[PDB]
Subunit: 334 residues, 4 copies
């Protein structure tokens, strides 16, 4: 029954931080500390209230919080990058992207709910290792998902499964039609987060930009499920790949975390007598170069395309990415 979803006497400082919920560059780490490591629960609660999703979908308030806490409890606290903080961050970034001027009134509430819920569960119960590692070891997960998008299929199943715990079904008052539509979009979005799908996603996105249509209002025209879900997929995907576009201070912390996680896998791999995966070798690591390359061949190409689709709404995000790209470049030891 508390103000932001959880109990905390630093509630005033947290309240002040959550004022930036609609802003790119939210101090998600401070919010994580101030909420007692409940960034996903408080940030989702704030966004649901802000968007009036509880009333619109008849979600009892206690059910929402029980589910959110349950969901957050299933992200691993010992995983440096793919944890609840990353989940909270993607949820909040997706929230900002959905509010872009070029997309106003374009998506329905159910579609908005789907993008946000998808963002919240997109990495749930991530072991801290890649699909390839899960595949090489013949893990039960790899076997159940026939080696195809193992982690991603797993994130979805868990997200939906938790809905079944006590007082966790936040979709209990949606009609069958709403639940099927929602479920489909969510699945379509989370499966798209698998990096092995990046190129085809980006390709289709560019195509859409090439044939970009806008209504009498200055907003994007999306006439069919295919184009709609495609935008939602690239949106969430952009949010999942938005670290380099945040204020350097936040970006650098994500870099330290993604590397700390990659090195754990690297170590675990050499212990098991496996070939150390790329960028997972703390002994042969070029953190800076790696980040620059990540931007040059992945992040910038994606955000440059998204920027065109919603031009000029994302111009500042793109400028920050470039400023950050140059910082790391200047950090590469020679």
């Amino acid at each position: 029954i508390p103000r932001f979803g959880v109990k905390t006497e630093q509630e005033d400082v947290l309240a002040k931080e959550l004022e930036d919920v609609n802003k790119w560059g939210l101090h998600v780490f401070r919010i994580a500390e101030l909420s007692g490591n409940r960034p996903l629960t408080v940030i989702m609660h704030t966004i649901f209230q802000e968007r009036d999703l509880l009333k619109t979908f008849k979600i009892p308030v206690d059910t929402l919080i029980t589910y959110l806490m349950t969901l957050e409890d299933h992200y691993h606290a010992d995983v440096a990058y793919h944890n609840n903080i990353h989940a909270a961050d993607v949820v909040q970034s997706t929230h900002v992207l959905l509010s872009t001027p070029a997309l106003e009134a374009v998506f329905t509430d159910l579609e908005i709910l789907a993008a946000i819920f998808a963002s919240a569960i997109h990495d749930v119960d991530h072991p801290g290792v890649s699909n390839q590692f899960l595949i090489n070891t013949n893990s039960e997960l790899a076997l159940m998902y026939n080696d195809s998008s193992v982690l991603e299929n797993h994130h979805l199943a868990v997200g939906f499964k938790l809905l079944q715990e006590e007082n966790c079904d936040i979709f209990q008052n949606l009609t069958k039609k709403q639940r099927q539509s929602l479920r489909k979009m969510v699945i379509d979005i989370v499966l798209a987060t698998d990096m092995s799908k990046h190129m085809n996603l980006l390709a289709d996105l560019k195509t859409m930009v090439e044939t970009k249509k806008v209504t009498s209002s200055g907003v994007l025209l999306l006439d069919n499920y295919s184009d709609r879900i495609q935008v939602l997929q690239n949106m969430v995907h952009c949010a999942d790949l938005s670290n380099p576009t945040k204020p350097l201070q936040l970006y650098r912390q994500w870099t330290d975390r993604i590397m700390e996680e990659f090195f754990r896998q690297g170590d675990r791999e050499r212990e098991r007598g496996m070939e150390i995966s790329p960028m997972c070798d703390k002994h042969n690591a070029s953190v800076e170069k790696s980040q620059v390359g990540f931007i040059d061949y992945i992040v910038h190409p994606l955000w440059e395309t998204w920027a065109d689709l919603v031009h000029p709404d994302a111009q500042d995000i793109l400028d920050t990415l470039e400023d950050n790209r140059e910082w790391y470049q200047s950090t590469i030891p020679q």
Copy 2:
């Protein structure tokens, strides 16, 4: 005794299109998949090539066959034996002579044998609509096909059932990836794509100085195997009318049963599952015209003219059913 002699006579057509699979099922005490698989395995000296202890092969086959539903009219062990035998025939076609390795041959055959294991008699969509545990587990995507794979492989783990116990790590690794690629291709929701990309291949077709089809990379190799097994799965209409008619009676019984269940549950009845407003004859012609014939005609172009006789039996059965529609 008399039983063995009759069954052995029938097993003699194992390499021919039109095997009396229904007779074999009867005579083998309902073990058509086990007897036909073992038959084919010896016929291809597969037990020797991959050093598969015989007792282990029979144990696994009976196990796999046991996980096919006896109460399911169409998607049962007979269908499985049929797709296995049919793929066995397509593998021996002239244009593919000496093309595939013993390992790839094993994969297409294994894939065929498990492609529908533990089939419940209802479609993916029915399992999705009812929120089945299976659908939730595979996120509504190729639900049954993913399950067929999982069961097929998991069954290798039962007592004295690992028929790949002697294959090397590299072999197992390669087999697993091909079977997954093959079975997942059986999902009809992926028919249009397979057929479209199969035609694209026939247009860039490349025959070697041996008159045999040339397949360089894995992508080309697998696509042919996926389509081969896909044609085998969709071969009922190209078989002798005697068999084809039985397959039709069986699939309709299964579809009608799904419709009765949907009617029970108040769900909307699926197309061709309403026993009160059905047109079996008409549906069969439509199935051949928009799906079966379009596909088998493409396969004919790839192995021209190896499948000419199959393609003619289809057009023939097509007419038989057409001249059956009342007025």
Copy 3:
């Protein structure tokens, strides 16, 4: 199945057979036939209405029918004995046992609900082979349940799991308290149907009958949970082992079905080179002898003890058992 609010031919016939639902010896096989192979759904529905369980527990009728059909759909039609007709039989039998005068007003509606629900799901998804066969073949079911009460654990897991399919949660309106109590009782009852528990289960029933206490009206007195659940467990165990107490005409059909199922397992075991389980070899079977043994060592000792518990309430039932015993005895070919 009806037509214009007025019943159809078969339904009427089914309705007239269902009038003996409160009687020992219902023509359950005729009902299976008349109901289009839906004996479990029709009998469960008849009983829920008779005991007013839908109003008492606010179960929407459509939800109940949907779950019942779903539950019945998970019993294997290709299994001769452990199928939906058996489930229906144990349900109707438990139902008759609950109405014994010696137990009037003893149990609450929740306990009555648990006894009935447990009966309905007690053998769901039975594969037609024993626990030992699943253990010796290293089935995944055996692995999942660590070879302990494999099938009984599975029956339970499936029975509860089905409540989660579309519009199948018949307990959606019970409070958490009612659900946790119902669930514990159902679990305790079903796990007790494992024959390996028979001896200890019977020992405690006798012990209870030894210390039997009545309210000078015949009405048994069950204070604590330990005695209440024990009686319920034994009740459903009796229903499960009630075939030998039904009119011979019914009993013989059950005997033919169990033998068919046992012989099939033997066939599979002989195929697989496994040793043939007791009474599973069709080439060396003593059907009449086996039934005699089954009655003398298991069924008669159980029912005689139950006869004592509710005496004289089960005198007729015991009389039928002994008569069927003699009949089978005189049938043994010398």
Copy 4:
């Protein structure tokens, strides 16, 4: 290597009851389970005896230890290492010399190693109340223990992890049964009877020629093994005070975190899990008085007098905590 020596030195106590398991955890890069298990397996020549390839042993150990949650304060790889090492010491109790076969010894050490694998840091009742997937799968009965067994055995199926590959079908069947019997008995709800039967076995106690414990039937042999591992799992209070207080701090951190989770959810806060109404000291004394002491009193009363030093340490530790009880 500078530390490799220190670690190797610390390992000179692998056979001593009081090993600084925490030190081994640090010096080994947090691989106390893999390290202790390897040392002990060689210590007993288990590798050669059962023909267990070193690779497969280390790979499974790392794979097993990796499924222990590093975020959990008490039920983690360190606790697992401690229980393996402890069971190891007890197995060497003179009153048991030559009593157990190598397969029975492997069974008790393996069980120990996986007895808490994949523990989420919350109790069975917490999983039951929340309607967790695990509880629904295991029907609220020994939920976690069933899970610990499942994961322990399943991890043998991963890449080069099956350490029991070279065992006959008879060995494997017996090992599996024994392990299951041991881990399932670690469920505290099984405590009262497990102790009851242990006492009875001590009354009718009987020794052989050498004067070593006489265990005829499986029932008795497994009962001794079940209780042995149970004592190892309930051995914290019997270790030197320094180690004991570390464990106490650890269980309490875990318990309070559950209480915090129960409180966030408006759930009833479980006994001793409320950091606002805690009696850490009084609870340790109650734990020793009503559970740990009666248990160890009987064990030492079965391996008389090998566990005398242990029992006395326990009693000393109890008094220390008792003096820390406010009021």
